[PDB]
């Protein structure tokens, strides 16, 4: 039972680390998408700012 | 012995890592909301200036 118990306790941990890694990767995809969005917005706000002060 | 003691920093840490990810998800969810809100407010302005 000893060596067996130790094996299962390893397996659960390693499985869990993989879950955590996948979650982090998915979260990194989300982050990169938010960066895309922020860039998009920044440009459109910058154009609105210049337009209002090009008219001025 | 050393096994039970070793599994200790590891299990503690695994749960720490999990708690961190969950909290960062809440942060991601909040940045998404913020981005959606701004998008809608930029539009409102652009469409206002395109109609004016």
């Amino acid at each position: 039972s000893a060596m067996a118990d130790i094996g299962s306790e390893f397996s659960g941990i390693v499985q869990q680390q993989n879950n955590l890694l996948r979650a982090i990767e998915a979260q990194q995809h989300l982050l990169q998408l938010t960066v895309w969005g922020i860039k998009q917005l920044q440009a459109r706000i910058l154009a609105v700012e210049r337009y209002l002060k090009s008219g001025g | 012995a050393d096994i039970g003691s070793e599994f200790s920093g590891i299990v503690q840490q695994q749960n720490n890592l999990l708690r961190a990810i969950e909290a960062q998800q809440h942060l991601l969810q909040l940045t998404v909301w913020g981005i959606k809100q701004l998008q809608a407010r930029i539009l409102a302005v652009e469409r206002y200036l395109k109609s004016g």
């Binding site: 979650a23 998915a26 989300l30 998408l33 | 990810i21 969950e22 998800q25 998404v32 998008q39």
Partner: peptide, 30 residues
């Protein structure tokens, strides 16, 4: 793979990744 990216695609990916992350976190709990 990312481009061509748009606000529609952006939204669709946000939703799928989020659901994915929820799935992983929920599997983590039990």
């Amino acid at each position: 793979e990312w481009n061509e990216m748009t606000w529609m695609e952006w939204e669709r990916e946000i939703e799928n990744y989020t659901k994915l992350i929820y799935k992983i976190l929920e599997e983590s709990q039990e």
